[PDB]
């Protein structure tokens, strides 16, 4: 179950807790395109946010 009212049928999760064996996890995701080049969009969108855990 996701937090913050993120509906799980549209936002993906990854994670690295496991009881089988810990194996020095890492990942480098795909390129996400930042939204636009407007200056009025650069205000009132002052950050880029990943919802993380651990």
């Amino acid at each position: 179950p996701l937090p913050y009212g993120l509906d799980p049928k549209r936002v993906p999760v990854a994670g690295t807790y496991s009881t089988e064996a810990q194996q020095e996890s890492r990942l480098s995701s795909a390129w996400y395109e930042l939204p636009a080049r407007d200056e009025t969009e650069r205000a009132a969108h002052p950050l880029v946010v990943i919802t993380a855990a651990g």
């Binding site: 990854a14 994670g15 690295t16 807790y17 496991s18 996890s25």
Partner: protein, 54 residues
């Protein structure tokens, strides 16, 4: 404000270089949120339960 104005693509990068059981992380694809101030969202008509500290 950390990323410059020509920056276009982002990609989340993680690592779990700690092999104990209590050391794990989780991610979620990055989002630029639609930010509204609290006074704009919560008006002066919807009754809130303020905690006593605030």
């Amino acid at each position: 404000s950390e990323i410059p104005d020509d920056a276009v693509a982002v990609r989340v990068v993680a690592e779990d270089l700690s092999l104990s059981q209590g050391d794990w992380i989780a991610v979620t694809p990055p989002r630029v949120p639609e930010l509204q101030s609290v006074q704009e969202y919560v008006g002066s008509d919807q009754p809130v339960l303020m905690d006593w500290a605030v």
